[PDB]
């Protein structure tokens, strides 16, 4: 009964999974002029702003007073840089209207109309919200998996709505995901700018090539008996997670088969039923996760039939706290809950050996 926030948030998704991927090999040979490290030492990219800025933009072309939690901000962009962000926009929308545009769809109108450097510097600071326990907005990682992204690999678009501090809309575009590698078949039309992944709550997990995104496959998480035939996903990045004691959780449940591959792409595997536990610990114990990293991934994991919770409680995670998850780390699997409290409990075990 969100009708218009799913559409919404399909098409814009949509958009910015086409331009990522078209920008990807553009942005990768040219990292001295297209490619900023924040004050947290991590990249962002002209593909990272331009998907922002679309995502931003449809969302207040369609819904004007709403909130938006967005990971990135203007702040300190020289013109020359916003000018490469309107130009690949403009870019991607020649080739999009031509081939892919959605009739009666609006990413832009007379208030929002994307046109000048300055309207790209607001669309991209509508991003600035602090979040919280009570209402309506949205949550948004344009690019997910950056350093995937630059690594020619894999990354996500990513986005959500929270209300009340519970999600209950998620997309995720994974435009370079290509199913025949993890062993499944892919459908036609993925070759374009791969899939996209998508739930409300309450009314199940979907998903459908991008360049179609019309016509949706219900997808669900497996079910197997054993571990020792089941497999992790993990991110490819060492930082970004406790590697080490991920591989002594497996060693302890005899899980053999790994996936690595950066962003929240791996949860759409999971609700696919490709494989069957996201592994996330913290490596030190004071960072906090954004929201925009877990967001979209909740809810199109619990429609799958999936469970969600931190890496050491075995709690849900709460995105009514702001900008941050308080809790430490992250772990998803297909459940059973007997199955996942066997995962969470080694990991904390694990964390508590150290
Ligand atoms: N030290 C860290 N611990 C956990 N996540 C991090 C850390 N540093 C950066 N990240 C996040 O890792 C995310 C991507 O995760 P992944 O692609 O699964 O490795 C990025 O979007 C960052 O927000
Ligand atoms: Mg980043
Ligand atoms: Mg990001
Ligand atoms: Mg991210």
Not at 320 to 345: C, F, M, Q, Y
């Amino acid at each position: 009964a969100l009708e218009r926030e799913l559409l919404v948030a399909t098409q814009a998704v949509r958009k910015a999974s086409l331009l990522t991927k078209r920008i990807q090999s553009e942005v990768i040979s040219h990292k001295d002029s297209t490619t900023i490290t924040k004050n947290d030492n991590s990249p962002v990219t002209t593909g990272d702003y331009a998907a922002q800025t679309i995502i931003i933009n449809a969302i207040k072309s369609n819904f004007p007073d709403d909130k938006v939690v967005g990971e990135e901000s203007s702040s300190g962009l020289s013109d020359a840089f916003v000018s490469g962000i309107l130009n690949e926009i403009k870019a991607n929308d020649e080739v999009y209207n031509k081939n892919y545009k959605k009739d009666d769809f609006l990413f832009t109108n007379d208030q929002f109309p994307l046109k000048s450097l300055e309207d790209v510097r607001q669309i991209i600071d509508f991003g600035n919200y602090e979040g919280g326990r009570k209402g309506r907005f949205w949550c948004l990682d344009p690019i997910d998996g950056t350093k995937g992204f630059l690594r020619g690999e894999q990354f996500a678009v990513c986005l959500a709505l929270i209300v009340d501090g519970v999600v209950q809309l998620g997309c995720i575009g994974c435009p370079n995901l290509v199913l025949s590698s993890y062993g499944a078949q892919d459908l036609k039309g993925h070759e374009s700018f791969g899939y996209i992944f998508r739930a409300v709550r309450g009314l199940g997990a979907f998903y459908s090539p991008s360049s179609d995104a019309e016509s949706w496959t219900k997808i669900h998480v497996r079910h197997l008996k054993d571990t020792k035939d089941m497999i992790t996903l993990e991110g490819v990045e060492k930082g970004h997670s406790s590697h080490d004691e991920q591989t002594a959780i497996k060693n302890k449940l005899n899980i053999s088969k790994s996936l690595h591959l950066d962003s929240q792409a791996k949860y759409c595997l999971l609700a696919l039923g490709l494989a069957d536990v996201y592994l996330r610990l913290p490596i030190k114990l004071s960072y906090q996760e954004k929201i925009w990293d877990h967001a979209a991934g909740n809810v199109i994991v619990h429609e799958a039939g999936g469970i969600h919770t931190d890496a050491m409680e075995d709690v849900p995670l709460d995105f009514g706290n702001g900008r941050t998850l308080a809790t430490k780390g992250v772990i998803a699997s297909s459940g059973p809950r007997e199955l996942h409290d066997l995962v969470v409990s080694t990991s904390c075990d694990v964390i508590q050996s150290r």
